[PDB]
Amino acid sequence: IPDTSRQLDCLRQLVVVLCERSQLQDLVEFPYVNLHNEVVGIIESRARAVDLMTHNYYELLYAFHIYRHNYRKAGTVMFEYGMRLGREVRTLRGLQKQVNSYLACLNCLRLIRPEYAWIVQPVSGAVYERPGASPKRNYDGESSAVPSSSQIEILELRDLEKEYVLAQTRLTLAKHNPSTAAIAGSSAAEEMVALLVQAGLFDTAISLCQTFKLGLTSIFEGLACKCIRLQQGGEAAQAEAWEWLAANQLATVITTKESSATDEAWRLMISYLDKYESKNTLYHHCIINKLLSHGVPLPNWLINRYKAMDAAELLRLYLKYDLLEEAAELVL
């Protein structure tokens, strides 16, 4: 067929009758030459006119892009599909679909050439289902890409990584309790870190803080509070906190028959300090203040380590708790 008008008409007829013929695998089986852009535009126009999530237009577009080596188009198609899924379903299935869409988009962004390090994202919409019935399926509109209104966004990689980290944190929060999905989605990084600390996920909270480029002061305060609870409680406290302490990777090289929550927390703190040094020992002062607020003497190993690593800040902080004899023997 030579004329482009009849070519586009036949392409539209194909895209109309294939939904009933159930043979939409020809574009993936044999390569489409001299008509790839035409069929892509036809499928895009059909998806913008009719259908939403019932048909597999976005899946076919992603498959065709993967077959013909197209990463940015597959990524934006998956982004549009995730947007449609979020507009349709909003519960647990919608959350799972959003997480899968974010994952696939991050994969399409990472699978690009190493010479590139950016991506573009416009706005779009969908409406209607089938043009062989009454118009207006639902009360909703579409979105048009306007460059004057800053509709087109330029995304790098760190923003997508932070978005996926927030998505996985919301997924973990929903798995812990499936009733605060909107709360986890509308909350901030500090609120998510506080929730993870209150639940008992110190490793995930530290990962969240290091991804968001913040401070581990809240996680360290929570760990100090848990350690104080372990020191002040009997065997019941140890047995109750073992379930939350074993999830922090307690694979240290120590002696045998070491079934003590106190020693486990001590080794966990030692490993944390050895694997992630403090900025300017501010976390040390934070832990010292947290322990002085309760009124428990510092452990001997930490006392020796602090005596070997410093000397003045201890005397400066002792004035908060009014320790006379300790500072006296220290200065002596």
Binding site: Y128, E129, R130, S134, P135, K136, R137, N138
Partner: protein, 91 residues
């Protein structure tokens, strides 16, 4: 209140215009006109608070129909109705 309330939920399918074109209540242009004429003539309401409440409810219904539906003929008495309501103390 439940008799006056009719709803406003739409549908999520293509074959919905053929079902929404056969509306009720609003198709009776004589009943709404008679109700508007009676409310303009103002029945002898011995309770000022109840009269203000009725006027405010009618103004709210008219404003909702004007901002949502469109099969109406007149809807400009909402401001004087609200003025009469706030003068007669409905709350």
């Amino acid at each position: 209140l439940y008799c006056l309330d009719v709803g406003f939920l739409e549908q999520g399918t293509d074959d919905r215009e053929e079902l929404m074109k056969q509306a009720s209540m609003f198709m009776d242009r004589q009943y709404i006109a008679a109700i508007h004429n009676r409310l303009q003539n103002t029945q002898p309401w011995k309770s000022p608070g109840m009269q203000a409440t009725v006027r405010l409810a009618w103004a709210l219904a008219l404003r909702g129909i004007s901002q949502f539906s469109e099969v109406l003929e007149f809807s400009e008495a909402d401001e004087p109705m609200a003025e009469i309501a706030i003068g007669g103390n409905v709350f």
